[PDB]
Symmetry: C3
Subunit: 160 residues, 3 copies
Amino acid sequence: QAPKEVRCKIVTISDTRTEETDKSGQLLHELLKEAGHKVTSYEIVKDDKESIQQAVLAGYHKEDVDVVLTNGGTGITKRDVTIEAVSALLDKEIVGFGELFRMISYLEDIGSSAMLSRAIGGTIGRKVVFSMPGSSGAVRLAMNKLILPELGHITFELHR
Amino acid sequence: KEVRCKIVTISDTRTEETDKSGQLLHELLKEAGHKVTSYEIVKDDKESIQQAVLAGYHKEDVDVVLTNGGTGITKRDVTIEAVSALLDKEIVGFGELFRMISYLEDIGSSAMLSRAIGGTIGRKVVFSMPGSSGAVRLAMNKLILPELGHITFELHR
Amino acid sequence: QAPKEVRCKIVTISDTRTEETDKSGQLLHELLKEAGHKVTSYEIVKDDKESIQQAVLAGYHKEDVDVVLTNGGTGITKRDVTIEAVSALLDKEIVGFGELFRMISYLEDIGSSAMLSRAIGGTIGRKVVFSMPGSSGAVRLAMNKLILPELGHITFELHRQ
């Protein structure tokens, strides 16, 4: 009867970003607001597995949070642990997210660089989590091409 | 090369009279020059799914097992996990290309949620796809049908 | 600065090929040289898990080797073990390599056959490994579309890490 309002927690994974410099977290808020959704939780967490997992679970336990969106901490180096940290908490991995994110990035944005891109999405109970790279461009593509178009559908399916 | 296939429709609600996808699989195979040697609608639970796949594997006149239905992102959708546990080697390109093609040529972003898996079991192969006839049609026309002969040939060498 | 010269080891997985008939190994060398890179190690290894892993680790331990590139031994049958053999050694798998390799192969070269193609890329310490099918067409695509464009950046990222 009306565009469902999805409530989300934004998590920016970085050892250096602050509220004044968190461009990607700010972008996530603007994209969600414009799409008719709401941000009910936001925090910048240190870049380590335990901090990331704690932030995701904190969002999960918040009554007014339906989805957890994280950005940053991804990469091919040993110090990049976002994907592994989040993967460990997922009930079911929505593999199509990471796959299509890379495919679309390759064809429409960064080309071959997308080969090194890492992203993951999945469910935890009746809620969902999407973890994307930290650049604003990665965030914008993932949100506009994949997440925003499906948020309402996913939450609906998980709550039924 | 007339590949023999078993068709498994995973559903708690479909019947022979309403199984569109199972019927479509029949038609697509027939038109392609292949044959259906086994068919059944099995309840939607992990054990019924696995038993149906293994039943096809153990049938002398079944080269390939094709299943449709039971997929999804919810807790009660277990097809991919049920079938994955039985595979010797996963043909990862099936699920991947199925989603890529679906995204580009059909359902767009909805494909991000689509689930499908293919792989080998001994000298046989299994392909599990979503339950809608559209998913079945795309998977068969774009990926499975053109490769059935090639795969069975490679596995029987 | 200047185009960094990456040092690579070429591994051809085969029970029949010889240095004279190794068409794919020769192609890899050519592509790398024209791209400004260098081959500091090369060997044709028998097609079995243990030989493949040994050849990859030998490359890792070689002081003047930054990247290991293997071709051959891939397939969907039980006797094709390259991907599983290499996968067991990787610290972190660069999933985008295999995925994009198949996607591009589908769209530009072999269509549906790409569904059966197998390839894997990943890191071992501060070094990287890419394993691709043995056909010249597979090698050409993997190298031109994905590896060559990113070699410099990858090694750079891993050297600093």
